[PDB]
Design a protein around this ligand. Structure first.
Ligand SMILES: O=C(NCCCCCNC(=O)c1cccc(O)c1O)c1cccc(O)c1O
Ligand SMILES: [Fe+3]
Length: 277
């Protein structure tokens, strides 16, 4: 009836089937959506398109992803607060208000970490069988995309402010290489930074990948698509990716604002599969 949860930032004591659930990670939000679990509150300042129903006033607004409304959280008295990387620095302040579970993915072990996070949610809400069904469905997706991914060397690029940053194995977006079997154009790219590693257009040209996965950060942070325009560049057009029409624009509503949930991971895999073949 009381759960002891060991997470990356500490230990939370949470009542099973907690009544008031507050969510600061959109992957967890889409997980609770999928499982039919009622949510009390979330930061409504920037909600992913696919989760737009959670913009409803039926949900209490607890601010933005990096600025929680502590007054409002105090008023709610949550039974559980779910957080991920963007709120890690505020863990103590949140835990003072209610039980706080860090449920970001450890990208050094994406599949294991994802699995554990989802199974925890199943245990907390009595949804263990439905979580297991969805995890099996996702495994089937992964296997299928692995067959498509052979020999297709890829570089992962995020665009922001007319600039490009790169990601590789073990990184925020490492699962493309680490789970879905897409080979790395740059196997030595060792990225642990949320916003990736600054690189030149010349660097992209030099790596000359078969496939270029592009995540438009400005589309969700600034509200205007800038990825196509940013990729419009003399040196990038020299790559096999540009030539062969293998520049794949991954939806930042899923990849950037969200990720690590039942629905977001499923849709992420679909976007990779569709991009390859
Ligand atoms: O710690 C983080 N950011 C601190 C620096 C913020 C720099 C300012 N960013 C924005 O205004 C912004 C707004 C909405 C969503 C975002 O992710 C943003 O980065 C962070 C952690 C994990 C994932 C991210 O993505 C992050 O950012
Ligand atoms: Fe960010």
């Amino acid at each position: 009836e009381e759960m002891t949860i060991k997470h990356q930032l500490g230990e939370a004591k949470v009542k099973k089937n907690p009544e008031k659930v507050v969510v600061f990670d959109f992957g967890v939000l889409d997980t609770l959506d999928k499982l039919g679990v009622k949510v009390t509150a979330l930061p409504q300042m920037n909600v992913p398109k696919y989760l737009e129903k959670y913009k409803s006033s039926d949900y209490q607004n607890v601010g933005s992803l990096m600025e929680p409304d502590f007054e409002k959280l105090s008023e709610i008295k949550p039974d559980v607060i779910f957080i991920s990387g963007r709120q890690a620095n505020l863990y103590d302040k949140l835990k003072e208000i209610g039980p706080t579970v860090y449920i970001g993915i450890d990208t050094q072990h994406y599949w294991d970490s994802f699995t554990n996070n989802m199974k925890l949610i199943g245990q907390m809400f009595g949804k263990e069988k439905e979580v297991d069904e969805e995890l099996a469905n996702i495994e089937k997706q992964i296997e299928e995309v692995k067959t498509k991914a052979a020999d297709k060397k890829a570089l992962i690029i995020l665009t922001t402010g007319g600039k490009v940053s790169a990601y590789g194995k073990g990184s925020r977006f490492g699962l493309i290489h680490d789970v879905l079997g897409v080979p790395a154009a740059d196997p030595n790219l060792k990225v642990t930074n949320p916003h990736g590693q600054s690189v030149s257009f010349e660097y992209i040209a030099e790596k000359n990948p078969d496939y270029l996965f592009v995540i438009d950060r400005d589309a969700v942070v600034e509200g205007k698509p800038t990825a196509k325009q940013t990729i419009e560049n003399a040196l990038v057009k020299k790559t096999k990716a540009y030539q062969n029409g293998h520049i794949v624009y991954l939806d930042p509503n899923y990849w950037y604002l969200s990720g690590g949930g039942l629905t977001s991971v499923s849709e992420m895999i679909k976007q990779v599969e569709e991009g390859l073949k």
